[PDB]
Write a protein that binds this ligand. Structure first.
Ligand code: BEF
Ligand SMILES: [Cl-]
Ligand SMILES: [Mn+2]
Length: 128
């Protein structure tokens, strides 16, 4: 993928945003911005130019499933890749996120190799 691809990393725990940002930096992606919940995320996304979203689920103000549904329903961003990265591991959560249009899903705790693989799986799927 294009190393200037602009990522939005969304999680309500600063520790996880930091992990994801650093993993992206290792992979060669330095154009990375953070958001703390779905509302903060949508404000950032309205500024434009984003190419990929990595998102948590359990967050205040607007949770990640609602963020994913908002993105998918909005004509300005409906094709934005969205990777869910969440501690929710139950199959009903996976099914609900998948059905809502998640580009991929990673269960916390996750390894560096898992995130790279799942990112690459999405890049390949979308011809990026
Ligand atoms: F709070 Be996230 F869903 F891990
Ligand atoms: Cl998978
Ligand atoms: Mn959370």
């Amino acid at each position: 993928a294009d190393k200037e691809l602009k990522f939005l990393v969304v999680d309500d725990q600063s520790t996880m945003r930091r992990i994801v940002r650093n993993l992206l930096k290792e992979l060669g992606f330095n154009n990375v911005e953070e958001a703390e919940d779905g509302v903060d995320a949508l404000n950032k996304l309205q500024a434009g130019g984003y190419g990929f979203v990595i998102s948590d689920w359990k967050m205040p103000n607007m949770d990640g499933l609602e963020l994913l549904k908002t993105i998918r329903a909005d004509g300005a961003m409906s094709a934005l890749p969205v990777l869910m990265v969440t501690a929710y591991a139950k199959k009903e959560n996976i099914i609900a996120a998948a059905q809502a249009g998640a580009s991929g899903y990673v269960v916390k705790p996750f390894t560096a190799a898992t995130l790279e693989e799942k990112l690459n799986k999405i890049f390949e799927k979308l011809g990026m």
